[PDB]
Amino acid sequence: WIARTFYDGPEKNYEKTMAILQIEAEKAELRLKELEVRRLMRARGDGPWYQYPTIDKALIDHSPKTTPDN
Amino acid sequence: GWVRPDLGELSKVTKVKTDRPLPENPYHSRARPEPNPEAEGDLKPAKHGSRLFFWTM
Numbered sequence: 001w002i003a004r005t006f007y008d009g010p011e012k013n014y015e016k017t018m019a020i021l022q023i024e025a026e027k028a029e030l031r032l033k034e035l036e037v038r039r040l041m042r043a044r045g046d047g048p049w050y051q052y053p054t055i056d057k058a059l060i061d062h063s064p065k066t067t068p069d070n
Numbered sequence: 071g072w073v074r075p076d077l078g079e080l081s082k083v084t085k086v087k088t089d090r091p092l093p094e095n096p097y098h099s100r101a102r103p104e105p106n107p108e109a110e111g112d113l114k115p116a117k118h119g120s121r122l123f124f125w126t127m
């Protein structure tokens with residue numbers, strides 16, 4: 001009666017633990033991958049992150065400058 | 071038979087017919103570096119949320 005009224009079968013806890021383990025293992029893998037990706041982008045600078053600004057090329061004046069040799 | 075140019079005439083911008091080829095690279099520029107991959111795609115929710123320590127959202 002106690003088991004019927006208050007508790008649940010072993011399979012429920014078993015499968016819930018499987019799901020929790022899957023979720024947290026995926027999270028750990030994603031954390032390692034994030035660290036590696038951050039290191040690579042900061043070292044190289046070829047990704048969307050760590051893009052430090054440079055001078056805009058639309059600021060340059062392309063017109064004769066009173067002197068042929070600029 | 072020489073006629074003196076009037077005011078405002080010697081300061082005009084004119085055109086020249088020449089056979090000299092137009093230089094393709096007068097600045098002697100090098101090859102420009104290739105730009106970044108400029109990723110594009112569809113946004114999906116972050117996988118398992120923030121994933122910051124014990125937070126589940």
Ligand SMILES: CCCCCCCCCCCCCCCCC[C@@H](O)O[C@H](CO[C@H](O)CCCCCCCCCCCCCCC)COP(=O)(O)OCC[N+](C)(C)C
Pocket residue numbers: 003004005006007008009
């Ligand atoms: C002769 C008898 C011998 C055995 C006596 C046993 C008496 C039991 C009393 C102590 C029980 C402690 C509580 C244990 C469980 C409570 C918490 C939780 O586990 O139970 C909840 C349920 O709790 C109960 O609904 C309520 C328990 C409250 C007991 C109160 C007893 C004492 C009350 C005293 C009041 C006195 C009167 C007022 C005077 C002013 C959730 O259960 P639920 O998730 O649904 O279960 C679903 C199971 N399924 C999935 C298989 C279907």
